[PDB]
Symmetry: C3
Subunit: 452 residues, 3 copies
C-alpha cells in the first residue's frame, strides 16, 4: 500500500516565465503530465499533488489528467513556498491521520522518471526495511543538485544543497534525485524537527536524511545508473537538454521498430506519435501531438505535422500541416500548408504553393500549383488548374478539369466531368460536362513596343 506525493507548488523563479514551471512542455506533454502518467502506471493507492500560487491555473489540468488516466488524484494546497519539506507536510494532510502505507515523494520537475524506476524504489525500500530510501545518480556536472554525503563506511550520512555545500563538497558527483520512499511514521517525525536555518532559508526535505540517521534509523541510497531518468529541470537550459535526451530515445524506439530516421538530431517526435514500418523521415522534421504515419511513407525534409493522419505509401515533403488526414499513396509538397479540417483522399496530390483549409478532396484528385482551397468539397479524379482560388461551401464533382487562373466564388456547384477555361471567374453553377468560360478574346496590337 503506497501513497505518492508530487511536489508541484514551488514558484519556479529560475524558469523566468509567466507560465508555471510544471506546465512547460517536452515531446508533447507538460512536465506535470509526464510525471502523473508515470505514477498512474505504477497505480498507487493514493496520488496527491501539492500545488501553490497559481493552483487555480494547474488544478484543472490535474482533474483532466485524473479522468484521462481514469483514477483519483487529490490536490493538497501549500499556501506559501516554505520549502520541499513543508510541501511534503502539506501533502501528508490529504492522507488520513492514521495512514500506514509507504510514502513516495517526487518532484514535478523530474519528467523522465518512469514507472519502473518507481517500482524498483518501492521494492528496495521494502526489502531493506528502510525508514528512508533515496534515489541518487552520478553526474559529470552535478551543479545545483544536493550532494550525497557518505561516511568511510560508504554509508549515507546527509544530503547537502548546492547553495549550502562547501567548495570541496561541490566536487561530489553523486547527487540526490529528489525521489524518495519513506516509512510514514519516520517521515512525520523527521518533518517536525526541520528548521530553516540554511542558505535558502527554507524547510529542506533533504534534511530528513541526516535527522533519521540521528535517530539510528535505516537510511538507504539506491543508485540509478541511467542518470536521465532522474534528471531535474530548474531552468530552460535544463528543460531543452532533457527534451533533447527524451527525443533521442523516442526516435531510437522508432528506428529499432523499423523506421528510418535519417537525422535523429533534427527529427522531433512527440510521445503519442505512431509511425509505420519502412517510413523514411528526412531531416528538419517535427511530428507533433497525435500524428500517425503509416508504412512506407516519405516524410520529406522540413515538414511539421501536428495531429495529422497519413496513410501508407504517402509522400509529405516540406509541408506545414495540422488537424488533417492524407490518404494512402497521396503526394503532398514541397511547400504545402494544410490547415485544420483538410482531408485528402488516397492517391490525391497537393503540390507546391498550395494551401487547403477545411476542405475534403477526393480520391485521385490533384491540386498541383499555386492554389488556395478553402471550405470546399471536391470529388474524385478531378484536376484543379494552377493559380486558382476557392473564394469562400463550393462543391466540385468528379473527373472535373478546371483551367488555370479560375476563381470559384462560393457557393457554387461544378458538375461531374465539367471543365473551366483558363482565367474564368465562376459565380454560377456549371452543369455536368459543361465548359464554363469568361475570359475575353486575345487581341494582338502590332508594333506597340516600337511606339510605346
Amino acid at each position: 500500500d503506497t501513497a505518492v506525493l508530487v511536489l508541484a507548488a514551488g514558484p519556479g523563479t529560475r524558469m523566468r516565465s509567466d507560465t508555471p514551471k510544471v506546465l512547460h512542455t517536452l515531446a508533447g506533454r507538460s512536465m506535470l503530465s509526464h510525471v502523473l502518467h508515470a505514477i498512474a502506471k505504477l497505480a498507487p493507492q493514493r496520488l496527491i499533488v501539492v500545488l501553490g500560487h497559481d493552483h487555480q491555473r494547474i488544478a484543472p489540468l490535474v482533474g483532466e489528467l485524473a479522468d484521462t488516466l481514469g483514477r483519483t488524484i487529490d490536490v493538497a494546497l501549500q499556501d506559501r513556498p516554505l520549502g520541499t519539506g513543508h510541501a511534503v507536510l502539506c501533502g501528508l494532510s490529504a492522507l488520513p491521520d492514521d495512514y500506514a502505507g509507504n510514502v513516495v515523494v517526487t518532484s514535478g520537475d523530474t519528467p523522465l522518471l518512469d514507472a519502473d524506476t518507481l517500482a524498483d524504489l518501492i521494492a528496495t525500500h521494502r526489502a531493506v526495511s528502510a525508514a528512508v530510501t533515496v534515489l541518487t545518480t552520478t553526474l559529470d556536472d552535478p551543479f545545483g543538485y544536493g550532494r550525497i554525503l557518505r561516511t568511510q563506511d560508504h554509508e549515507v550520512m546527509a544530503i547537502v544543497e548546492q547553495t549550502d555545500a562547501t567548495p570541496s563538497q561541490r566536487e561530489i558527483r553523486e547527487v540526490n534525485a529528489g525521489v524518495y520512499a519513506f516509512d510514514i511514521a519516520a517521515l512525520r517525525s523527521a518533518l517536525s524537527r526541520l528548521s530553516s536555518n540554511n542558505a535558502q532559508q527554507e524547510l529542506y526535505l533533504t534534511d530528513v536524511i541526516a535527522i533519521l540517521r540521528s535517530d539510528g534509523q535505516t537510511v538507504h541510497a539506491s543508485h540509478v545508473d541511467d542518470s536521465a531518468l532522474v534528471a531535474g529541470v530548474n531552468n530552460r537550459v535544463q528543460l531543452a537538454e532533457l527534451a533533447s535526451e527524451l527525443n533521442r530515445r523516442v526516435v531510437a524506439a522508432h528506428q529499432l521498430a523499423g523506421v528510418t530516421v535519417v537525422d535523429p538530431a533534427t527529427t522531433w517526435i512527440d510521445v503519442d506519435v505512431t509511425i509505420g514500418r519502412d517510413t523514411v523521415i528526412h531531416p528538419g522534421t517535427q511530428l507533433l501531438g497525435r500524428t500517425q504515419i503509416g508504412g512506407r511513407c516519405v516524410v520529406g525534409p522540413d515538414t511539421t505535422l501536428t495531429d495529422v493522419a497519413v496513410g501508407d505509401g504517402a509522400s509529405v515533403v516540406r509541408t506545414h500541416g495540422s488537424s488533417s488526414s492524407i490518404g494512402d499513396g497521396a503526394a503532398v509538397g514541397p511547400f504545402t500548408y494544410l490547415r485544420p479540417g483538410t482531408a485528402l483522399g488516397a492517391d490525391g496530390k497537393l503540390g507546391a504553393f498550395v494551401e487547403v483549409k477545411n476542405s475534403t478532396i477526393g480520391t485521385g484528385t490533384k491540386v498541383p500549383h499555386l492554389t488556395y482551397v478553402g471550405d470546399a468539397d471536391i470529388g474524385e479524379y478531378s484536376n484543379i488548374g494552377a493559380s486558382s482560388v476557392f473564394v469562400n461551401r463550393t462543391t466540385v464533382g468528379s473527373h472535373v478539369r478546371t483551367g488555370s487562373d479560375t476563381m470559384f466564388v462560393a457557393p457554387v456547384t461544378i458538375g461531374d466531368g465539367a471543365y473551366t477555361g483558363a482565367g474564368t471567374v465562376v459565380r454560377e453553377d456549371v452543369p455536368p460536362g459543361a465548359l464554363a468560360v469568361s475570359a475575353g478574346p486575345q487581341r494582338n496590337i502590332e508594333n506597340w513596343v516600337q511606339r510605346k
Copy 2:
C-alpha cells in the same frame, strides 16, 4: 595474390525492413556499394560476394557495380543463413579447389571500411606470417560486438559473441571488427571443425580464432584506432549514427578544401558531390546524388538539391530541386521548386513561390514571383510577370516582358521584344514587338458598398 569475400547473405532481421539490410543507404550509396568501392580500389585478384534470400534483388545491383568499377565480381550463393562461418564456406566455393592466395573476409554492414585499412591488414598478415589476422578496435559501448579474449601474455585466445559472453566478458571493450585475413589452408581446416552449439545456434566465423589457436597456429590481432572505419550496422540506430559520422567527415573535407559550412551538423553532403572554393553553405541543407556546386556560391538555408549543377557566384536559397542546372551568377529562392529538366541561364532569376519543370530559361531571364513554368523555352533577358502559368511546348523569345496574371496556353510562340498586358490569356502566337491583351476595361460602380 588475394581474394576478398563480402558476406552479404544474412536476413538482416534487426533492421525490421522489407529492404535487404545491405541495400540501406548512407551519403548517397548502399552499404554494399560502399564496401565494394573500397575493395575495388584495393584491386584484389578475386572479389566474391556471398548472397542469400533476395539474391534476386541484390545480384543485379552487384553486376551494375562490377561494370561501374570495371572489374569482375562473382556472386556465391548461400542457400540458408547458417552463420558467418558457413557464409565464408559458401564464398570459398567460387574459388578454385587449389587456390593459394590469401583470403580476406569482411561483412556487407561495415560501410566505412576503406582501401587503406584493408591494405594495412594484408600487410600485417604477410609480415607476421599469420594464419589469421583479425582487425579489432576499442569502444566505449561494445554492445553486440564479439569481444576479444586475451591471455595474460596479451595474446589473442578467442572471440566471444555478445549473446554468448558472460556478464564479466561483456565489459571487455576491445571488439572484433569482423574483418580478417587468412592463410587459405588454415581457413578451410578450421571451417570444417565449426559446430553450432552456441547461443544463436549458428556457425560462427569467429570460432576459427580459438580453433587455429588450438592448432598452435599464429593468430594476430591488429588494432584499428579510428573505430568508425570498422564500425558495424545491425539496426537503424547504428545506421544513422554511422551516417552522421561519415557526413561529418565529408563536410570536414570540404571545409579544409575551402568551403564554409556554417553548421556541419545540419548539412548533409553525399559522397559524390563537389563544391567550389569560397561557397558558403547555410544550415538545414542537403546536397544529394551528383550535385555540383561551383565557387563563391551561397546555398541558403533549408535547400535540398539532388543531381543539380550550379555555376559559380550563384545563390540557391530555400530551394527544393532535382536534375536541373543553374548558371553562373543566377539567383534562385527563397521558396523555389525545381523539377527535373530545369535549365536556368547565367544571371537568371527564379524567385519566391516559383516552380519550373522541364523548361529552359535563357541568360538573364527573371521569373520572380508566384509562377509555374512547365515544358517551355524562354529566351534571354526576358521578364515573366508575377502570378503567371505556362499551361502545358511554348516558346517565348528574348527581351520579352509579360504582364502579371498571364496564362500561356501551350503551344504558343511569343516573339522577341513582345509584351503581354496584366491579366492576359494567351492562346495564340504574339508577333515580335506586339502587345497581346485580353482583359476588359475597369468599371467603377460608385457607392456600391453603401448599397450592398
Copy 3:
C-alpha cells in the same frame, strides 16, 4: 598602463579563402571584430593592430570599428609574414621608443577571448612580477597548438610548435593560448635574439619563452580552464566548431533570461539579437544581425530573420525576412518572404506564399494568400484577396476588401471602404466605397465535353 597588440597580418593559407582569415564571421561579427570588441571593453591605453598583405582590405574595417567603439586603434604594417615574433616587432614600432607600460599580445584568430580573461592576465602578470605571462589551457585534442614544456618543478621551460614537436611532445595536452603579457624591455630583448631555424622557417613569438627563461627571467603560465575562450581558428573546421560553441552560449544566455529555445542545436542567434521573455523559438531558426524579438512571440520552425523587428505576441513561422518590422500581435507565415522596407502593423497578417517588398501595411490588415505586395502603402483593417499582385506607389485605404485575382497596376489609389471584384485589373483610381470590376460574365457551354 597597457598596450595591446593584435596580430592580424598572417596570410591565412589554411582557410583556403580569397577572404582574409580575420574577416571570416561567426554570430554576426568577423573574428577581428570579436577580438577588438573584447579589447576595447578592457580599455587599454594603446591598441595596435598589425596588418599585412590585404591591409588595404582590412584597415578600413578597423577604422570603422575604432569609431563604433569610440577610441583610437593604430594600424602597424608588417610587409612580409616573417612569423608571429616579427609581427610583434612590427607592432612595437607604433609605440614610442621609450614606452614603459605592459605589452599584451593576442592573435586575430582567437575570437572568444573576452575582456575578463584579458584583465585576469594583466592582473596575474602584475602580481607575480613576471617578465612574460602566457595563457595556457588543456585540450583533449591539442593538434596544431604549441605545447607547454615544463620541468619536474612544474616550471615553464618552453613552447614547442606542432610542426617542431617530437611524437612524444605531441602527446602534451597543455597548450599555448597565444595570449601573453610582457614586461616591454624583456620583450624587446628576447625579440632581438629570435632566429628562424625551425620547421616553418619563421620567427616564432613562442621562442621568447625559452629565451627569457635563459636569462633567469620570471616566466609565468596562467591556466584558462574554460578552453573555448582561448581556442584558435586556423581553418574552416575550427571556425565552425567555435561558431557552434559560441552559439550554444548565446542561446543559453537567452534561455536563462526567459526564452524557450526548443532546439539549441538548430537555433542560430547572432550576438546583437535581443529576445523578450516567454518567446518560444522553434527548430531550424536563424536570428541574424540586429534582429529584435519582443515578448510572448512564436518564431516558428524554419525562419531566418536578419535585422527584423518583431513586437510582442507576434507569430513568425517558416518566414524568410530582412530589414522589416512586424507589429505586436501580427501573424506572418508559414512560407512568407519579407524583403527590405516591409512594415506590417500590429495585428496584421501576411500568410502563406506571400512576398512583400518596400511596402507599409496598416494595423489589422490581412494579405493571407499567394500575393505579391511591392512598393505599396495599404491602410488599416483592409483585406487583400488571394492571388493578387501589386504591379510596380499604389495606395490602398482602410477597410478596403479587394477580390481574389486583382492586379493593381501602379500607380493607383484605392479609397477607403472600396471593394474590387474577383479577377479585376485595376489601372485607375477607385473612389471610396466604390466597387471596381473588369471580369466579363460567366458563359456555360453545355455538352462541350461530350463534343470535344
